[PDB]
Each structure stands twice: as C-alpha cells, then as structure tokens.
Amino acid sequence: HHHHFNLPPGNYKKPKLLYCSNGGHFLRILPDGTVDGTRDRSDQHIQLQLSAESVGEVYIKSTETGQYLAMDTDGLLYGSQTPNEECLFLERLEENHYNTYISKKHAEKNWFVGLKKNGSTKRGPRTHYGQKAILFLPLPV
Numbered sequence: 001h002h003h004h005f006n007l008p009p010g011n012y013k014k015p016k017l018l019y020c021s022n023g024g025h026f027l028r029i030l031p032d033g034t035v036d037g038t039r040d041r042s043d044q045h046i047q048l049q050l051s052a053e054s055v056g057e058v059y060i061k062s063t064e065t066g067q068y069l070a071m072d073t074d075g076l077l078y079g080s081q082t083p084n085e086e087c088l089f090l091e092r093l094e095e096n097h098y099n100t101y102i103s104k105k106h107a108e109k110n111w112f113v114g115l116k117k118n119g120s121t122k123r124g125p126r127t128h129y130g131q132k133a134i135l136f137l138p139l140p141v
Contacts, residue, residue: 008098017046017138020137030079067079075123101136110128
C-alpha cells in the first residue's frame with residue numbers, strides 16, 4: 001500500500017460525529033451534497049455512520065440523508081447519493097490518537113478528508129500528512 005496500517009480502535013456499530021480538533025468542527029454532509037464543518041453539535045447532518053468495506057476502508061454516510069462522503073477527482077469532498085469508488089476512505093489512526101481518512105481512490109496522492117479552521121473542507125491535494133485539518137476524533141452521537 002501507500003500508507004501505514006495503524007487502525008483506530010472502536011467499531012462501526014453506532015453512528016459517530018467526526019470531530020475535527022483543528023477548528024472544532026464536526027464534519028457535515030449537507031442535504032445538497034456540500035460538505036463542511038460545523039461546531040453545532042445539534043446539527044442533524046453531522047451524524048455519520050461509518051462502515052467497513054475491507055479492513056481499514058470505510059464509507060462515511062450521513063445518517064440523516066444517506067449520502068456518502070466522497071472525494072471527487074479534483075479533491076473536493078461531496079455527498080454522493082450512492083457509494084462509488086470516491087466514497088471509500090482509508091481510516092487510520094494518526095498521532096496515536098486521531099482518525100484520518102484518506103481517499104482510497106487517491107490514496108497514492110495522500111488526499112485526506114480535512115476541515116480547515118473556518119469549517120471549510122480541504123481540497124485533497126492541499127492535504128498531507130502532518131496537518132491538523134486531517135485529524136478527526138469519532139465522538140458518540
């Protein structure tokens with residue numbers, strides 16, 4: 001592979017909030033398919049159900065809308081109505097603590113899910129190992 005295989009603990013039984021320490025935002029997949037971060041813990045669009053494909057590969061699905069987080073060919077996160085290759089992420093432990101999500105499709109380019117401090121998503125190519133934007137903590141809902 002192009003990436004390590006330190007996996008985070010826990011499981012996919014329950015939905016999670018993906019909290020980005022960077023700006024303190026929860027990853028949000030809006031009904032119109034846009035993705036951003038919100039600090040509003042009560043937001044209905046931050047509840048995400050992760051599920052495994054292969055070990056360490058996940059889908060990240062909005063429980064509210066059913067949309068799958070996906071990263072497009074230009075590195076933009078979006079909500080996909082159906083699971084496609086752009087929707088798979090390599091979920092890894094990072095800094096012995098956080099979860100990171102690398103686009104499987106673009107794994108060789110090290111494109112991560114990331115939220116900037118202002119709650120906007122990072123574009124894939126603007127992410128890289130070592131960043132704060134890429135570091136998530138899955139919180140219970």
